[PDB]
Paper text:
The binding of the plant phytohormone Abscisic acid (ABA) to the family of ABA receptors (PYR/PYL/RCAR) triggers plant responses to abiotic stress. In the resting state, the PYR/PYL receptors are monomers or dimers and display a wide empty ABA binding cavity flanked by two highly conserved loops, named as gate loop and latch loop. To investigate this issue, we have selected as a model SlPYL1 which is a tomato dimeric receptor with known structure that is involved in the induction of stress responsive genes and drought tolerance. Interestingly, the analysis of the structure of SlPYL1 shows that Glu 151 is not involved in the dimerization interface or interacting with ABA; rather, it is located in the latch loop.
To investigate the relevance of this amino acid on the receptor function, we generated a mutated version of SlPYL1 harboring a Glu 151 to Asp substitution (SlPYL1 E151D) at the latch and studied its biochemical properties and compared them with those of the native protein. The overall structures of the apo and ABA bound forms of SlPYL1 E151D are nearly identical to that of WT protein with the differences confined to the area of the mutated residue. The Root Mean Squared Deviation for 191 Calpha atoms are of 0.33A and 0.20A for the apo and ABA bound forms, respectively. In addition, the ABA bound structure shows that Asp 151 carboxylate is hydrogen bonded to the NH of Thr 128 at the C-terminal end of the gate loop. This hydrogen bond is not present in the native structure and might account for the increased stability of the mutant protein in complex with ABA with respect to that observed for the native protein. In addition, the analysis of the ABA bound structures of SlPYL1 E151D and SlPYL1 showed that Glu 151 replacement to Asp leads to the formation of an additional hydrogen bond linking Asp 151 at the latch and Thr 110 at the gate. This would explain our data showing that the ABA bound form of SlPYL1 E151D displays increased stability as compared with that of SlPYL1. Interestingly, there is a reduction of the RMSD as a result of ABA binding, that indicates that hormone binding stabilizes the entire gate loop despite it does not make any direct contact with ABA. However, the degree of such stabilization is higher in the mutant protein. The complex nature of the denaturation profiles obtained without or at low concentrations of ABA hinders the calculation of Ti, however, SlPYL1 E151D protein displays larger Ti than the WT in the presence of 4 mM ABA, showing that the Asp side chain is involved in the stabilization of the protein.
Author numbering:
A (entry chain D000), B (entry chain D000): 28 to 220
């Protein structure tokens, strides 16, 4: 029947084992899900050579996904938008023609622990039951500093598609956006200001 | 009625004016098209800190688009594939679910001038009449060497879509793949071998 994910029990690509062992409790706490037979889930990681708060300042901007995500034509939150759990955004995504619309809900926002997450709750695309969580972590070794971002999701496998294609699609989207996040924040860190 | 494109008469993003003035004859020769009212066309550029042949070795691999393009699940050319004008490839693209299929024809392959191009001639997506050309150019200044890649396309604007969304879609795809090309070839150049 239902199962618990195992992301917190194996090393995700692009993470070292030493890094994983430092993150294993966070992965258990924030990146575990109970999933049903029609669902899949994945955990992706991205190392970033920038301080945590530099990365978090970008990651946390629910109303400006275009700043670290590809193919965002627009994102609207409506005036009086205040960043609070339950707020929603309408994203127009130009990954194809016509452009897709995704309505997304802010699920988590913890500025102290550097955790956020959202759920897709409308739109005209095929990803159903999509929910993701992103956490940001600082590392240090001999005075050197870096960040690891972890992003996991759960989603329904769409009718007529395999889990492997579903995971390949969502994994590729998340991985490429994490690479943009790394570039944007490493540029920020390099240039200071 | 029909018009000639003007890419060879203005500076595309990410190119310096000095670079453009060196490339203007190539842009006129390889990146100009006669287009009809229902069509749009764009020219994109990418500077790469690697020698021309390092970039060209990758650009020229019609059967391995996955090496510098995002979201390629597979590409099949069939046994006895020989790289000749008229050869075709079946690309499966995982930019959405279900994955798209594009059947593409090799239009140009000039290893001396570093020119290639392809036309989409089948599949189950919406891009109709898509044709692109890619050229690769070497620059030198005071012993320093770099490459510029130019990629242009012509495509039909799909029913119910604006030219601006059509250009935004194709421009973003091409720009992001040119960035992967730059990363892949700059890594190659940095590591030599
Ligand atoms: C890029 C794209 C293409 C689709 O077909 C679905 C949807 C529009 C939701 C999406 O924005 C997917 C976004 C995902 C998976 C994650 C994110 O944004 O963190
Ligand atoms: C990424 C993608 C999404 C689509 O919806 C159309 C198609 C499948 C053709 C495509 O491969 C487009 C590829 C383009 C424009 C250029 C290329 O490859 O040089």
């Amino acid at each position: 029947l239902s199962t618990i994910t195992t992301h917190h029990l194996t090393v995700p690509p692009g993470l070292t084992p030493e890094e994983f062992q430092e993150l294993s409790s966070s992965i258990a706490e924030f990146h575990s899900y109970r999933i049903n037979p029609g669902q899949c889930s994945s955990l992706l990681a991205q190392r970033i050579h920038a301080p945590v708060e530099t990365v978090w300042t970008v990651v946390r901007r629910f109303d400006k996904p275009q700043t670290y995500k590809h193919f965002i034509k627009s994102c609207s939150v409506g005036e009086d938008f205040r960043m609070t759990v339950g707020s929603t955004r309408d994203v127009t995504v130009i990954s194809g023609l016509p452009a897709a619309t995704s309505t997304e809900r802010l699920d988590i926002l913890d500025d102290d622990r550097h955790v956020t997450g959202f759920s897709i709750i409308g739109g005209d695309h095929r990803l159903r039951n999509y929910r993701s969580v992103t956490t940001v972590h600082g590392f240090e070794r001999d005075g050197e500093i870096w960040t690891v971002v972890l992003e996991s999701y759960v989603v329904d496998v769409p009718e007529g598609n395999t889990e492997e294609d579903t995971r390949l699609f969502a994994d590729t989207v998340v991985k490429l956006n994490l690479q943009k996040l790394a570039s944007v924040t490493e540029t920020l860190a390099r240039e200071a200001g």
